[PDB]
Design a protein around this ligand. Structure first.
Ligand SMILES: OC[C@H]1O[C@@H](O[C@H]2[C@H](O)[C@@H](O)[C@@H](O)O[C@@H]2CO)[C@H](O)[C@@H](O)[C@H]1O
Length: 146
């Protein structure tokens, strides 16, 4: 793993150190705190706050009731169709590893050593240069393989 970021402060907004070509991994190890209702990993085009940077890939675990993962894309400050994965491995007070693998046509995401979901590209992954992590989460490490 390359360009590892250790224990970043959340909210984190970092420049991804290379283009996300097919086969690239983003690996994120962390922990959901006991009072967490949600957090998010956003692959974004730039880091503008107003107007809000486009989010190619919004990966948003949610913990209310039985919980779920919501995926979407933000284009021109509008959210598109939500893709909700209900078989969620995330739990409050548990550790996790997320591996996002960028393929040509989709993202392939594995959580805790197990395939979790797919997400077809809506914005070309070549437009992504920024990783954002927000909400209630404790991130121990961010690693990249190009
Ligand atoms: O799709 C991701 C965004 O959802 C926004 O919340 C949605 C909510 O999930 C949906 O059920 C509906 O009622 O409308 C809300 C507004 O679009 C969150 O506010 C945003 O942060 C993203 O997670």
């Amino acid at each position: 793993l390359q360009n590892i970021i250790y224990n970043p402060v959340i909210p984190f907004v970092g420049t991804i150190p290379d283009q996300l070509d097919p086969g690239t991994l983003i690996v994120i190890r962390g922990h959901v705190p006991s009072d967490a209702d949600r957090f998010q990993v956003d692959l974004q085009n730039g880091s503008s706050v107003k107007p809000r940077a486009d989010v190619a890939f919004h990966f948003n675990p949610r913990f209310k009731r039985a919980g779920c993962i919501v995926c979407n894309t933000l284009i021109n400050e509008k959210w598109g169709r939500e893709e909700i994965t209900y078989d969620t491995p995330f739990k409050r007070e548990k550790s996790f590893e997320i591996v996002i693998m960028v393929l040509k046509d989709k993202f392939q995401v594995a959580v805790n050593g197990k395939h979790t979901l797919l997400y077809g590209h809506r914005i070309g992954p070549e437009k992504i240069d920024t990783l954002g992590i927000y909400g209630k989460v404790n991130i121990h490490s961010i690693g990249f393989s190009f």
